[PDB]
Amino acid sequence: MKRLTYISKFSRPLSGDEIEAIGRISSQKNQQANVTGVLLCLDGIFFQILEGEAEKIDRIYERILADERHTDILCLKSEVEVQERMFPDWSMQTINLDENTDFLIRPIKVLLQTLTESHRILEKYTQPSIFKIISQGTNPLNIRPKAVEKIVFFSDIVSFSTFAEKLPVEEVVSVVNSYFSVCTAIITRQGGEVTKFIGDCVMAYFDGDCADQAIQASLDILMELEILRNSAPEGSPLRVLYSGIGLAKGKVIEGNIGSELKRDYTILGDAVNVAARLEALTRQLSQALVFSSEVKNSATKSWNFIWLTDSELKGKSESIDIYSIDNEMTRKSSGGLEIARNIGHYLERV
Amino acid sequence: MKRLTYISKFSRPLSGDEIEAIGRISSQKNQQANVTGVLLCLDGIFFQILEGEAEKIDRIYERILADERHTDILCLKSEVEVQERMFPDWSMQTINLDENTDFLIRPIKVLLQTLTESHRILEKYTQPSIFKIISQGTNPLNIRPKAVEKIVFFSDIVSFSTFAEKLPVEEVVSVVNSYFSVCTAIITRQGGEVTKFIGDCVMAYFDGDCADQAIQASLDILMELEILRNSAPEGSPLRVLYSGIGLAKGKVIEGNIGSELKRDYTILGDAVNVAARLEALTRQLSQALVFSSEVKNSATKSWNFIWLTDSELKGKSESIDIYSIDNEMTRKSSGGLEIARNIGHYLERV
Ligand SMILES: Cc1cc2nc3c(=O)[nH]c(=O)nc-3n(C[C@H](O)[C@H](O)[C@H](O)COP(=O)(O)O)c2cc1C
Ligand SMILES: Cc1cc2nc3c(=O)[nH]c(=O)nc-3n(C[C@H](O)[C@H](O)[C@H](O)COP(=O)(O)O)c2cc1C
Prior knowledge:
Two copies of one chain form a homodimer. By secondary structure, chain A is an alpha+beta fold. Chain A folds into two domains: 1-143, no CATH class; 144-350, no CATH class. In chain A, 42% of the residues lie in helices and 29% in strands. The first copy, chain A, contains twelve helices and 13 strands. In chain A, strands 6, 7, 8, 9, 10, 11, 12 and 13 form an eight-stranded mixed β-sheet that branches. In chain A, helix 6 (169-189) runs antiparallel to helix 7 (211-231). The radius of gyration of chain A is 25 Å and the shape is elongated. The relative contact order of chain A is 0.11. Chains A and B meet through helix 3, helix 4, helix 6, strand 7 and strand 9 of A and helix 3, helix 4, helix 6, strand 7 and strand 9 of B. One flavin mononucleotide binds next to helix 1, strand 3 and helix 2 of chain A.
């Protein structure tokens, strides 16, 4: 059997009518599916444990995930090898702690709420991969390191130092966070993982057989930033927000890396350095998107590849053939590298 | 008034004798201090809320922090402007959920435990600064960005690519994590903050008037790594673990930086780039510790400074005078840069 524990937030205030309507329908449908567990609600927060056959649990959770009556749904625990139920006589008992006034309940209710609020804070500072791993039924702390082929993605804001020199601190942070949000949304949708931000740089990766998705993600980012630039208000710093992007491919180490008290689930390897070094060359090469021949050859779609140069850095003493893709979007984005050389006056005036 | 909520783990199994001994003494001392609240215990976990006058709360918490009967003590919430108690008739009521069997308690007990276990996982992936901010009574999500003078620290492992080429993946990760742990312990003790790991690199910062502590932290790291190298088993990769370090000083932006779902409380600015670029020069300059004249002049202690070079990168088109400190430890660590040029055979044989 499978047992799923999640928490969620009310999308909007819910009356007593609606709360017991949820319990009513949930209990009837879980009875049919031989699913048991408990649904708790407290100050506009839901907690639910559900247990039963994995296929039935997944289909129920799928409906729960689509229910517009709550949001911020976060699976805290997925157990996929359960052989004894924890709540057998209870298709879906519902408990409302708001209407509860019992003696020892008052301190436990406060603790539940404070734990949940603290957990919601830490979620905002936690890599998305950690919650994905948890939702697959794995404790991330017990993942052992492995060598894995990845496509590594590195991007940054062109002429970012001009933004920091010219704009108030709150506007600098607004620009960087807008950029990070654009990149993160598209990378994640294309099946990649944003693993680190450093300064105004994004580091991300894709499965090693997903060069096509990494390339498409990169082109979509350039496309989204074009929409952002040309839709921004007159005088907005967003009108001169341009990105450089570099991709590389290689065997890296994936796992928990860090100090005793603080680690990241992330990657380590030469392809990280290569992606960052390629991304740095975007200005010299006058191309917003650059990538290695290994990425080029790994792709299976008929992209309009253009050879740029044979270049070296390192280290390992081997030259690297560097490519881009030639289309209207990359030409426009590459012209943006030139525009961004002289945005100081424009930014001085926001 | 102040109200403090924390969680902790039993250091070792505790009997019923010891649990109520804690409640007994806690209630008597809190009665004296006019402190109220509740202490809960569940499967070897403590939860406590304490409220009263700030000075009395801090002294009680100080004793609690030193009590060897629990560990992993983590403050989840500090409220410093409380004007109404939450548990007035209760100097220190103790509730034991293990011995509890009530009806609606069983699901809430399970939820408490699952929330706590999940919270303990996220703690391991959370920057230390976030818990410090929380313990000072501030929600980190509501900190606005500010310009601040910092000393920025950047360090990495010399010839790290050789480690990755020669060692099994689990040993590579063991080495990097050992290094990260050494740096993080010393930086934190010296009043700095480790804010980011990237590859085998540590990025950290200190208050802008703390160049002396940043320099001392750097020298202590070199000292600790010497002890690590010369105490490691025969053939251990740790015997050839060397670091480079660079320090810079400048006005940076500090705040919440990232995407909508994932941010870091960290810094952004030119001094981050300068520290990393200086750290990269350690090999060319044959010096394990390098820093800018701005760091040198900001220090007030009579360090044995040595001028190394007048160098440029960027960007901003200004040359930077680069210094180190000349003592036995830096000379030994700098000779290690040379040794690390040719550790491939040594590492091939572990
Ligand atoms: C907090 C919450 C918990 C829910 N729990 C369950 C559940 O345990 N089982 C279930 O079948 N539906 C549950 N639902 C409702 C589903 O989202 C959905 O409304 C219903 O199952 C779909 O019924 P349908 O087959 O007509 O589409 C829950 C909804 C909410 C808001
Ligand atoms: C889980 C736990 C909770 C505690 N809570 C309190 C408390 O609320 N108030 C208190 O005075 N001591 C509390 N203590 C005990 C203190 O750590 C310490 O033993 C005692 O207060 C010191 O007494 P002293 O003045 O003789 O040094 C707690 C201990 C543990 C393990």
